[PDB]
Amino acid sequence: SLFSAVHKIEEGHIGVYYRGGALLTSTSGPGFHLMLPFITSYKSVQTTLQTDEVKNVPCGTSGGVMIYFDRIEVVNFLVPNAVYDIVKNYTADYDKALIFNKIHHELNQFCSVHTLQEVYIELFDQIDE
């Protein structure tokens, strides 16, 4: 009954509501909030700085040798006003389809132009940028 209506949003998140699969154009900030009892589903998307990583990323150097980055972490944040558009276009898991599904391709494209030494030592500080 009213148990489902209430829901905590947590600080630093924004809640997006689905009306049986359709995204309402109303978003709720942190704090106590109330929605419809059973025909609306809320999910909170983080709008503060957050981090996530991908492990064992291959990288083929210009010399034909393959080197595997153990871990590549990306720290990102989403402005609160664009949350509605972001979730509408790419759902609540936008990060996987926007960043971490192409990290490996970007790394391989960068590596293909640089040699093993060039990536391992010389321009290591430039890989991040």
Q: Is 121 in the site for other proteins (CB under 8 A)?
A: yes
Rounded distance between C-alpha atoms, residue 17 and residue 40, angstroms = 6
Smallest separation, CB 1 to other proteins (Å): 19
Could you say which residues in the range 5-44 bind other proteins, by CB under 8 A?
Answer: 8-13, 18-23, 30-32
Q: Closer to other proteins at the Cβ: 1 or 129?
A: 129
Rounded distance between C-alpha atoms, residue 84 and residue 105, angstroms = 28
Count of chain residues binding other proteins (CB under 8 A): 46
Q: Which is nearest to 22 in space by CA: 8, 5, 36?
A: 36
Q: Closer to other proteins at the Cβ: 54 or 104?
A: 104
Q: Is 80 in the site for other proteins (CB under 8 A)?
A: no
Rounded distance between C-alpha atoms, residue 33 and residue 28, angstroms = 7
The dihedral formed by the CA atoms of 31, 35, 41 and 46, expressed in degrees to the nearest 10: -20
Residue 3 makes CB contacts below 8 A (sequence gap 6+) with: none
Residues that bind other proteins (CB under 8 A): 8-13, 18-23, 30-32, 48-49, 51, 58, 60, 62-66, 73, 75, 88-91, 97, 101-102, 104-105, 108-109, 112-113, 117, 120-121, 124-125, 128
